Design a protein around this ligand. Structure first.
Ligand SMILES: Nc1ccn([C@@H]2O[C@H](COP(=O)(O)O)[C@@H](O)[C@H]2O)c(=O)n1
Ligand SMILES: [Zn+2]
Ligand SMILES: [Zn+2]
Ligand SMILES: [Zn+2]
Length: 248
């Protein structure tokens, strides 16, 4: 997603935190003055843009292109050295849950987990290697050029012309999505990447015309918005599992 989609995922999640996970999240955020779950949600994209070390190393962690394999993820094929969103989200979830680590180390893992639960729910982040997740699929949206990747990251969301205070209660108003009964931090990333890939392959998501506008927005903006709400509920369930339990 763009920066607003990332913040909205975090905002949906923050409201659903159990008291134990909320206390631990606030403890980690407090190590970075005035940080919130929303303000850190875009951080991994600015790290990618600005840090020639970890930023360059982590660029692959934002996606996994599995549509040419009909949305059947296989790590040795799509992800050999672990540089894809499925393996990165698994590892950063393990690091976040590691109570032996410093609050600074665990905040860094929280920043990756908040971002990548957002990205793994963006259909074009699990799409075709051929066109780099739609980045190479140029199209005209209204009287402006864009690409299919950007259209899903932010183009359709921007048509609401809402700041987060306007957009968040619209996402919260939707019918509740059906979640898995429990978070499995090691298995759910693959399930989520596959589900996002199946949306990228749905009839009409790749349009049959170079020029699109209101009809595309009317059909697919609700799907993008359903995916933000789903991402937020899935992020809260993950944080509630990873940070929410200690007894026994
Ligand atoms: N042409 C582009 C495309 C994306 N971007 C950045 O990448 C972000 C999206 O990253 P993800 O695809 O990982 O979500 C945008 O919010 C923006 O900051 C950019 O800065 N210039
Ligand atoms: Zn994103
Ligand atoms: Zn993107
Ligand atoms: Zn990203």
């Amino acid at each position: 997603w763009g920066a607003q989609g990332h913040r909205l995922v975090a905002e949906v999640a923050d409201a659903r935190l159990n008291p134990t996970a909320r206390a631990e999240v606030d403890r980690l955020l407090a190590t970075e003055p005035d940080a919130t779950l929303a303000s850190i949600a875009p951080w991994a994209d600015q790290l990618r843009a600005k840090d020639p070390g970890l930023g360059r190393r982590s660029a692959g962690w934002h996606y996994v292109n599995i549509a040419e394999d009909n949305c059947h993820y296989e790590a040795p094929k799509h992800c050999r050295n672990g540089n894809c969103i499925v393996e990165a989200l698994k590892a950063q979830s393990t690091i976040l849950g590691d109570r032996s680590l410093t609050d600074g180390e665990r905040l860094q893992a929280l920043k990756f987990v908040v971002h990548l639960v957002g990205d793994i729910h963006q259909p074009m982040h699990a799409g075709y290697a051929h066109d780099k997740g739609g980045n190479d699929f140029q199209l005209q949206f209204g009287n402006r050029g864009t690409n299919l990747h950007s259209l899903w990251d932010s183009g359709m969301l921007n048509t609401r012309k809402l700041d987060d205070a306007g957009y968040l209660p619209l996402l919260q108003s939707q019918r509740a999505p059906k979640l898995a009964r429990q978070s499995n931090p090691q298995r759910d990333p693959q399930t989520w990447a596959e589900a996002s890939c199946r949306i990228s392959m749905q009839a009409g998501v790749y349009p049959a015309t170079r020029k699109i506008g209101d009809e595309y927005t009317e059909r697919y903006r609700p799907l993008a918005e359903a995916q933000l709400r789903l991402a937020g509920e899935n992020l809260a369930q993950l944080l509630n599992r990873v940070l929410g339990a200690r007894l026994e």
